[PDB]
């Protein structure tokens, strides 16, 4: 089941951004030829998208093929939506509606709060000093996630 993590990481500069694992563009299909590690979407809470196929089929290939993709459309709520990942170069990327009160792009429910997740610190380094509060809210389904707030 770990075979669905896309692993394409071209660190040709020797930055080391892969250590964490070992220790304004709208959401859409993103070809996994450009993914380095987990692809998390935040519907109202964290989910771990894996390498899928275009018809939704889960492919256990680590994202090797040209037509291995991630599917971020397919998790949108019928609401506010964002996803993140680390592309191969190690630059963090974001997809979500444009913004005040309105949420950010990828994991920013607030302009100042972030949905804390297992690879949050890897994807967002500046967020370390943020302290966490717990939240339980309906928006038809009951979600439970953690907030990392500025």
């Amino acid at each position: 089941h770990i075979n669905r993590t896309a692993l394409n990481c071209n660190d040709s500069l020797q930055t080391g951004f892969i250590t964490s694992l070992f220790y304004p563009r709208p959401c859409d299909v993103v070809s996994a030829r450009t993914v380095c590690g987990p692809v998390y979407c935040f519907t109202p809470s964290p989910v771990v998208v894996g390498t899928t196929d275009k018809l939704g089929i889960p492919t256990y290939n680590w994202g090797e093929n040209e037509t291995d993709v991630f599917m971020l459309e397919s998790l949108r709520p019928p609401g506010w939506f964002g996803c993140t990942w680390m592309n191969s170069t190690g630059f963090t990327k974001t997809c979500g509606a444009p913004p005040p009160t309105d949420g950010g792009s990828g994991p920013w429910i607030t302009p100042r709060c972030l949905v804390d997740y297992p690879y949050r610190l890897w994807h967002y380094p500046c967020t370390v000093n943020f302290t966490l509060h717990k939240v339980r809210m309906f928006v038809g389904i009951e979600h439970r996630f953690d907030a990392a707030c500025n």
Partner: antibody
Amino acid sequence: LLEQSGAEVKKPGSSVKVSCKASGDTFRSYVITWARQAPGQGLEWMGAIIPFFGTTNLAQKFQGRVTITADESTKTVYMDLSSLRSDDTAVYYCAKAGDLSVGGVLAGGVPHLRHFDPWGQGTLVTVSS
Amino acid sequence: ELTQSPGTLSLSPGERATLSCRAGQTVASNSLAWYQHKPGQAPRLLIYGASIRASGIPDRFSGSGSGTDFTLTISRLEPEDFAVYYCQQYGSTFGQGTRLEIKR
């Protein structure tokens, strides 16, 4: 520093399993290669392994015959060849191809190769009846 | 797909040993190494990458080459430099090494 196993003598039919003790602390992201040389012929590269992800990809010659595995409980990477021949009676070295953390590798699951700065002592294996 | 030449070399200390390492299909000059192997010892790394000297490698050894062709060179031949020299590409393949011998 890479330590290796003792010289083993095995019958041609049976398999050999030689270890490699690894020094450093980032064992999860070490990419380790095995390769050997024939008393007459030159060096040739068998394959490289990744312990944390358990992914190897090997030369065209030993793609079917050899299996590489690693166990990180003990800082050791193992090396196993089924149905030895006299062609495979040779000297077997262990080399650290690269560190995944700073390697800039792990493309498409399969690991690419980098220079092998540390090299194991080597394990001879005499394969005769 | 590495073609070394010559097979053997025989030179006297203080001479310039020049040894080629060729490729049928072009290599990215990024990934090409040289190794010094002594019997009863473990192979040693001399050049990593392209024209870069590894650590613990005297100044005499010198990498070179771009594209398909490549060369190791030594200007001061010291008397321990007479081991067999393999070249190698990463990605990975070797050549049949060259033997460096003591002219007497």
